[PDB]
Amino acid sequence: AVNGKGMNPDYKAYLMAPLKKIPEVTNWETFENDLRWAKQNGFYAITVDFWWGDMEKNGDQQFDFSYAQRFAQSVKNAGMKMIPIISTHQCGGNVGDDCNVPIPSWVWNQKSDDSLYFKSETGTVNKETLNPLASDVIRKEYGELYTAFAAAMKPYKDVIAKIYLSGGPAGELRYPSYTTSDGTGYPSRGKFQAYTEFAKSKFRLWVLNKYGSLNEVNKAWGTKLISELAILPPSDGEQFLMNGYLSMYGKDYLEWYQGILENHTKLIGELAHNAFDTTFQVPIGAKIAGVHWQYNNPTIPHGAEKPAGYNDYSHLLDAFKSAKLDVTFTCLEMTDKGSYPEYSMPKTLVQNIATLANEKGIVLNGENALSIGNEEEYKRVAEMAFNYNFAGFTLLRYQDVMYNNSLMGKFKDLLGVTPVMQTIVVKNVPTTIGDTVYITGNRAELGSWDTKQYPIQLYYDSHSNDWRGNVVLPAERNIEFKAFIKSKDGTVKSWQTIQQSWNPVPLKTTSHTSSW
Ligand SMILES: OC[C@H]1O[C@H](O[C@H]2[C@H](O)[C@@H](O)[C@@H](O[C@@H]3CO[C@@H](O)[C@H](O)[C@H]3O)O[C@@H]2CO)[C@H](O)[C@@H](O)[C@@H]1O
Ligand SMILES: OC[C@H]1O[C@H](O[C@H]2[C@H](O)[C@@H](O)[C@@H](O[C@@H]3CO[C@@H](O)[C@H](O)[C@H]3O)O[C@@H]2CO)[C@H](O)[C@@H](O)[C@@H]1O
Numbered sequence: 001a002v003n004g005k006g007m008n009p010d011y012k013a014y015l016m017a018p019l020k021k022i023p024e025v026t027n028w029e030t031f032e033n034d035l036r037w038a039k040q041n042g043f044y045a046i047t048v049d050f051w052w053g054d055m056e057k058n059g060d061q062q063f064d065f066s067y068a069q070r071f072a073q074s075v076k077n078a079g080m081k082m083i084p085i086i087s088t089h090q091c092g093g094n095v096g097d098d099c100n101v102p103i104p105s106w107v108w109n110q111k112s113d114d115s116l117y118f119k120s121e122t123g124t125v126n127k128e129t130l131n132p133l134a135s136d137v138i139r140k141e142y143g144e145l146y147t148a149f150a151a152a153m154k155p156y157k158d159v160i161a162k163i164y165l166s167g168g169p170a171g172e173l174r175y176p177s178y179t180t181s182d183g184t185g186y187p188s189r190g191k192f193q194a195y196t197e198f199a200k201s202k203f204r205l206w207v208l209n210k211y212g213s214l215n216e217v218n219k220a221w222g223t224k225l226i227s228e229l230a231i232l233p234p235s236d237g238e239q240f241l242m243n244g245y246l247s248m249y250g251k252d253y254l255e256w257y258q259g260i261l262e263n264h265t266k267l268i269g270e271l272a273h274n275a276f277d278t279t280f281q282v283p284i285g286a287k288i289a290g291v292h293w294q295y296n297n298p299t300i301p302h303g304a305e306k307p308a309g310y311n312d313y314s315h316l317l318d319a320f321k322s323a324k325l326d327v328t329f330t331c332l333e334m335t336d337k338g339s340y341p342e343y344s345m346p347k348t349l350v351q352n353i354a355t356l357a358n359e360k361g362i363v364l365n366g367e368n369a370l371s372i373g374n375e376e377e378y379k380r381v382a383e384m385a386f387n388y389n390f391a392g393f394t395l396l397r398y399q400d401v402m403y404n405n406s407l408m409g410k411f412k413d414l415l416g417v418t419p420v421m422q423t424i425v426v427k428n429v430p431t432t433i434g435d436t437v438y439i440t441g442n443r444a445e446l447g448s449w450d451t452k453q454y455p456i457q458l459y460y461d462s463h464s465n466d467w468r469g470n471v472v473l474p475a476e477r478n479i480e481f482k483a484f485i486k487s488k489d490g491t492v493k494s495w496q497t498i499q500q501s502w503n504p505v506p507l508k509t510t511s512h513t514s515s516w
């Protein structure tokens with residue numbers, strides 16, 4: 001893995017449950033059988049959406065956690081674990097969606113103004129999640145829901161491995177910038193979603209707050225605004241993405257815009273930790289979408305990420321760390337294209353995020369964006385997960401592998417692995433002052449023969465007089481590897497003579513000794 005390390009000792013694989021309730025796609029008895037089968041293939045837990053629209057449908061505090069409790073019972077019956085997602089966002093509701101569970105209709109009546117929803121540059125209204133600007137309604141409703149859910153789930157704390165929160169549309173911390181109704185779907189540039197009167201007013205007050213008066217605002221922006229009402233969000237999103245973002249005004253508006261998401265993160269994290277910590281004592285996480293299109297567009301750089309709220313990922317990740325939430329990146333199986341008209345750079349994106357998350361010490365989890373039907377995609381996921389320190393990977397979705405034994409087998413082999421600590425020892429290494437010894441091998445866990453950034457570093461044991469290291473390998477998998485010397489200048493000097501193997505990697509910790 002990157003810099004000389006191996007796969008994450010805590011790596012675990014999870015399977016995403018279907019969108020519809022179990023009794024609609026199968027029955028409780030078969031479901032438990034499916035869970036034991038998934039468990040057999042390396043899956044540690046089942047992640048599942050518990051819809052707000054289902055749990056507090058009829059009215060304020062009129063809760064219904066019966067489904068969630070019944071689901072948990074079957075998970076306990078199958079000897080599995082579960083990761084519930086408190087889904088405060090809408091399910092489906094489009095042409096031929098596999099679900100349609102809007103957030104409780106009574107919630108929209110809590111306000112007379114337009115503070116609860118989003119309005120795009122072109123006036124498209126979006127109501128699939130509450131606008132993070134309405135922090136008062138969010139603090140009340142989310143706090144109530146999280147606390148009620150914790151109480152209801154208290155008896156099943158033993159099968160709960162982690163809890164996910166929905167930070168926005170599709171369960172991700174972002175703005176609903178890419179939708180068909182707004183004409184911003186892939187691979188198009190997104191649209192800013194801060195055009196409600198409430199949003200305009202907040203931006204205005206935010207600006208006046210940091211500068212004090214319009215005279216100070218005009219000094220900083222180098223503008224000539226006549227009145228405070230002239231303080232508005234981008235009138236032309238395309239022009240703003242082309243060059244407006246570079247201005248002092250552009251930096252300020254983007255700071256406010258992403259800032260709303262950062263504050264939402266800290267709010268929901270605070271409410272969640274208040275509600276779940278004492279009782280469950282499990283990790284809590286949220287998701288960040290993989291907005292890979294328009295990434296490297298020449299004229300509108302990052303034209304889809306910015307409207308979604310992603311301007312500075314480092315500053316964004318800082319919010320996750322302060323809120324004490326683990327991060328889940330939802331796009332691991334794709335590769336970079338970077339060509340017109342999509343300008344899609346999925347892999348570079350993931351690499352950037354992983355690097356940042358790791359520098360900050362944020363536990364990182366991954367997920368595939370679209371259903372995988374080819375082994376090659378599993379291979380791409382393995383490279384990112386095993387070389388960029390991912391603590392876990394969730395497979396979307398259930399039915400894809402549950403009803404396809406072949407795909408299930410390739411998953412078990414490639415991704416449904418159990419990390420195990422082993423000691424690799426190499427004797428007779430002809431090293432010179434400044435020579436470092438590494439090992440690389442066939443599987444993604446060994447860097448796939450890469451000698452540049454993915455090799456695993458060994459260390460000289462002064463006592464035993466040799467090179468060895470505690471490497472984490474996938475248990476019960478056949479591996480092949482060779483040690484190699486890297487000169488002072490970072491170039492490969494030589495390779496071990498005979499190629500080594502471990503068929504398979506032992507389930508128990510031992511050592512593999514070989515001569516140069
Ligand atoms: O709140 C002030 C002002 O903000 C908005 O106008 C922005 C515009 O969205 C930005 O792209 C940027 O545009 C400038 C305009 O001058 C050109 O010569 C430059 O090439 C662009 O970079 O800045 C302006 C404000 O300075 C909003 O559209 C507007 O209604 C509002 O009054
Ligand atoms: O927020 C949900 C989801 O959005 C993004 O997914 C992208 C995806 O990365 C694109 O390749 C593209 O896929 C479409 C999805 O619809 C199918 O019918 C088409 O066949 C695919 O080509 O668009 C989606 C949606 O914009 C994001 O990448 C992802 O991380 C996130 O979870």
Ligand SMILES: [Ca+2]
Binds near residue numbers: 056141
């Ligand atoms: Ca409530």
